[PDB]
Amino acid sequence: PQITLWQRPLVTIKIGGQLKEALLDTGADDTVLEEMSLPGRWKPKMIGGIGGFIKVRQYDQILIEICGHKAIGTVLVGPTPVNIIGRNLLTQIGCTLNF
Amino acid sequence: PQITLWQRPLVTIKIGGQLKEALLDTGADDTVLEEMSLPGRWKPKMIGGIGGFIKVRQYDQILIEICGHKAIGTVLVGPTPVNIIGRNLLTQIGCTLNF
Ligand SMILES: COC(=O)N[C@H](C(=O)N[C@H](Cc1ccc(-c2ccccn2)cc1)C[C@H](O)[C@H](Cc1ccccc1)NC(=O)[C@@H](n1ccn(Cc2cccc(C)n2)c1=O)C(C)(C)C)C(C)(C)C
């Protein structure tokens, strides 16, 4: 699909058999979901953008279905105010900036 | 152009005749620039990021030339680590997400 930006680009994603909203964020290197439950082992990592850093848990090779497209990659989990799909998954579905 | 995301989408922008580097950020409501001077009167504002919040100065009706495409609008100046082009400008150069 083509998505204009007059509104925040929130799109259905499915993970672990669940539906959630998430933000396609080309300004973000990684993907970061609100606190949730995930299988596998995880490593603590520290991220920060505007306004400081937060301690997030890193899972590797997690599958997420974004707008119906399958992508497998790292996903960060911590106290973000919004689920964030970053470029590490955005590449997987062949998403680009057009104009 | 059709910009992939294997790298952060850093492009060249032109403001008040000056050239700078900005990150095309679909995950940003607002455009936020690195401390600079801009004509006119500003209103104080709060913007929340991933870490937490920062306070920035709001300038209105600002001309800015993004990759050869003129767009006018609200630009926030504040202690940001990088110049951020937000949706309020991206819509203006007809930018969209496509996958
Ligand atoms: C409505 O609130 C907003 O729009 N907030 C905006 C915002 O923060 N938007 C989005 C999150 C978001 C989005 C929505 C909400 C929100 C809030 C309330 C209600 C609803 N939604 C909350 C948070 C995220 C925004 O892209 C920033 C842009 C950005 C890029 C670079 C440096 C600083 C800021 N990305 C990051 O912070 C990412 N980051 C940090 C560094 N790098 C790599 C890097 C390293 C070195 C150098 C460079 C260039 N990059 C990343 O990938 C993180 C670590 C968060 C993954 C902003 C910019 C205006 C504060």
Residue to probe by mutation, ligand 1, list B6, B10, B29, B50, most atoms within 8 Å of CB: B50
Q: How far is CA B20 from CA A50, A60, B13, B60, in A?
A: 19, 36, 5, 19
**Shortest CA gap A18–chain B (Å):** 22
Residues of B annotated as catalytic are 25
d(CA B66, CA B14): 7
Task: Judge contact between A13 and A65, C-beta under 8 A.
Answer: yes
The structure tokens listed for A67 are 């707008």
Please check whether residue A46 touches B, CB under 8 A: no
Helix-then-strand count for chain B, H and E: 1, 9
Inter-chain contact B98–A93, Cβ cutoff 8 Å?
Answer: no
Inter-chain contact A26–B26, Cβ cutoff 8 Å?
Answer: yes
DSSP3 helix / strand / coil % (chain B, rounded to 5): 5, 55, 35
The structure tokens listed for B78 are 């504040």
CATH number at residue B67: 2.40.70.10
A25 catalytically annotated = yes
A90 CB near ligand 1 (under 6 Å): no
- The ligand 1 atom nearest the CA atom of A30: 56
Please check whether residue B39 touches A, CB under 8 A: no
Residue A87, H or E segment: helix A87-90
Give the residue whose CA is nearest to atom 36 of ligand 1.
Answer: A49
Among residues B83, B70, B88, which one has the least CA distance to residue B36?
B83
Domain residues for the domain of A34 are 1-99
Among residues B99, B97, B80, which one has the least CA distance to residue B24?
B97
Q: How was this structure determined?
A: X-ray
Among residues A6, A18, A5, which one has the least CA distance to residue A62?
A18
Determine whether B26 is exposed, middle or buried from the number of CB atoms within 10 Å of its CB (0-12, 13-18, 19+).
buried
Q: How far is CA B50 from CA B30, B67, B91, in A?
A: 14, 27, 23
The amino acid present at B3, given as its one-letter code, is I
The DSSP letter of residue A96 is E
A81 CB near ligand 1 (under 6 Å): yes
Residue in B27, B87, B96 nearest the CB of A99? B96
Residue A71, H or E segment: strand A69-77
Task: Judge contact between B9 and B3, C-beta under 8 A.
Answer: yes
d(CA B24, CA B29): 11
What is the distance of C-alpha A66 from the center of its chain? 9
Number of domains within chain A:
1
Q: What is the resolution of this structure in A?
A: 2.7
Among residues A97, A55, A91, A45, which one has the least CA distance to residue A72?
A91
Q: Going by C-beta distance under 8 Å and a sequence separation of 6 or more, which residues neighbour residue B91?
A: A4, A5, A6
